Amino acid sequence: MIHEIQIAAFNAAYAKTIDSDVMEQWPTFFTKDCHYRVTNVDNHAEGLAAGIVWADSQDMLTDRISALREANIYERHRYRHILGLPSIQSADATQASASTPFLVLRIMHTGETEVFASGEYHDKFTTIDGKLRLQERVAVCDSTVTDTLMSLPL
């Protein structure tokens, strides 16, 4: 059985990977065939499908991280994630539908801290060789506004 604390420790490893900018590992939280999307409550209420980020393969995630490392121009900065306790909708021994509240702070290399996004992850989890793997993660942001740009994924 998948329970709330396997998910929360999974989430903590997820966040740690992004917050510490070990971003080459982020795509490995995911199955080869995953969905990942970043969106907002309005798009979600009205059923709109587009994402600030929209991925239907792990390879899509890896490509994103590569662009981040090799191509894109942006002012350096860090996120700090603060995750709440997941709640599970459905569940057996391999698989769960789940949701987790998140807060993401962005701290510019120059010092400013701001609440950058908040909301909930909408997850579909599976098990490969022992621990969890996201078949699907949709970051549904409480706000329609992104400040300046989004470089790091949520």
Partner: peptide, 8 residues
């Protein structure tokens, strides 16, 4: 319309 987002 398939998506709305705002950028500050």
């Amino acid at each position: 319309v398939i998506g709305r987002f705002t950028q500050k």
